[PDB]
Every structure is written in structure tokens, then in C-alpha cells.
Design a protein around this ligand. Sequence first.
Ligand SMILES: O=C(O)CNC(=O)C(=O)O
Ligand SMILES: [Mg+2]
Ligand code: NI
Ligand SMILES: [Zn+2]
Length: 331
Amino acid sequence: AQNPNCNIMIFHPTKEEFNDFDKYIAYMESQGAHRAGLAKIIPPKEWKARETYDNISEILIATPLQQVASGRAGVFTQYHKKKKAMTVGEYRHLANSKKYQTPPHQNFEDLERKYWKNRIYNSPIYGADISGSLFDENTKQWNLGHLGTIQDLLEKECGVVIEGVNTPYLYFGMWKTTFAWHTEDMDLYSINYLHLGEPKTWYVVPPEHGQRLERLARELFPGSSRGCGAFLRHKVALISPTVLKENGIPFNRITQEAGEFMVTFPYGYHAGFNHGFNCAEAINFATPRWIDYGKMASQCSCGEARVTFSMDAFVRILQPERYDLWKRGQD
Ligand SMILES: O=C(O)CNC(=O)C(=O)O
Ligand SMILES: [Mg+2]
Ligand code: NI
Ligand SMILES: [Zn+2]
């Protein structure tokens, strides 16, 4: 088997290899990339997402979220406090303010250390889950707004027609803005392009050891666990790499920089943080290989996780037994 230590692999497609998205995902998985739970894709030097980002200040962040932490440095939950709307311009200015800017540091490793030591003592504001794309419509390759849809994948593989659409989301980040330990909705893939700004650091557990993570999480957040058997779906728990080492949880880390794609694979748990003001775009996608992961995906039936319109149909078709109890959580 390829990639038996489950390392994060980095790919450098040629522009010829960058034409067929589905094919290159399949290629990466033939080299074992999926075993890590995450891969890096460096686009070919010829490729451009768009001409410039000169005009993006006028994008509105309707609901910025202040990420308030509770707990110890390496084991904490965060809750999202809703703030007043602001433009990307206002957000970027806020991200560069003395209160919120990235501190002095030698390298990513020094900054990682400061993040984990000082994360809980601060409340950065995130512009997350904003519907839209910054890909130019004339960008034909790896345009996240022009991928085949999950519904069409489901229909090609299983013969069933369902409602739903699937569109990209933008994420405006600043120093310390954090994404908690999670898999994608329905354990789908995700693809994330870092359009501009400072880096994003990612941690990931191999899908074949996801249950080990889940078990640690139940021990670390014992109340949350009683409340909901898929409480990582709530996207609030943080666990540091030190804590993961101490408890024997296999994992890897990598930093994504501007102009790079990351792909998460079905049931690859991930978490991470932003180094400073940036903007990423992301979307879930599926392959034939996803269908069984979707069949087996854990669901939140405590009602905290509150998920998209399009997820109804996935659960309804792939998880008909779960569908009576799950939709009562969604309503
Ligand atoms: O970019 C973020 O903050 C979170 N991104 C992801 O979890 C993803 O693309 O799967
Ligand atoms: Mg604008
Ligand atoms: Ni994700
Ligand atoms: Zn729940």
C-alpha cells in the first residue's frame, strides 16, 4: 500500500495535469495521499485564480464571529459571539490593528508555539461561511465555483435525483482565528484555496485512526460527549499537538500559503489556525470513493450542529434509518 506512514503529500501538477480535476484527485489517491487525511496541491506556475484582488474590500461580512475560548492552553472549547457587520476593508484594518495583529516571530514554528501558549487569552474575529467565490469566471482549471456537484455525483453513482446545490464559501481570517477539530459534513471531501494574505496552519489525523481522536475527545470533553454522540460536529473543541502527542494520537501538520490548494479527504479530522489577515475559499466535493463514507458518517442529533439544506437529501438517501431521528435535531 502507498503512503503507509500516512504523511501529508505535496503535489506539483503541470498545467496539462491541471485540466481534469476528478482525474488528478484519483491520481493523488493512487499515490496514497488520502491516507494522511489532507494533501497540498501547488498549482502550476502558469495558473492564476484571478487577475488581482484589488477590489475585495467591498465584500460584506454580515456576521463576523468573535471566537471566545474556555479551558486550558491545549484543551479548550470556543464559542462564537456574533458581531456587527463590516466590510472586508474594515475587517482587514481590524486584523492589522495592534490589538489583533500577528506578533513578532522568527518562523512558523515560533508562531505555532505562541498560538498554542497564548490562543485562549484572546478573542479573534473570523469572517466565516460567506457564500461567494473570488475565482474569475474565465479561470477554467480548479475553479472552486465550477466543480461538478455532489448531487450530480450521487446521481451518477446511485441513480437518484435529489434537490440541493453546492456552492463555495469565503473565509476571512486574522491572527489566532481558529478552526476546531472536525470532519466535513457527511464526511465529504473539501478543497480550500488560500487566495491572499498570511498562512494557514493545519493539523490532521489519518482517516484510519479517526476513532482514536474521537475517543480522546470524549475523555477530554466528557460533558459534551454525554450531550451528543457526534459532538465534534459542533466544531468547538480544540486539542493541541502536545496533547495529541501525550495521548499517542497519530497526526501531521503543514502550513498552507497564499496561492496553494489543500484537499481534505473523507473522515480526515482537521483543525488549524490563521497566521494573520487572509482569505480562503472552500467547498465540499465528492468522488465515487466517498459514497461509503457518506453511508457511515456520524450525525449530530442533539440539534447543535444545524447544517445545510442540501445535507437533508444526503442523509435521506444514504442514511434512511438515521433520517427520522436526525431531522428532529434539524427541526
Ligand atoms: O479554512 C478554515 O478555517 C476551515 N477550512 C476547512 O475546514 C476546510 O476547508 O475543510
Ligand atoms: Mg469589493
Ligand atoms: Ni474542514
Ligand atoms: Zn450534537
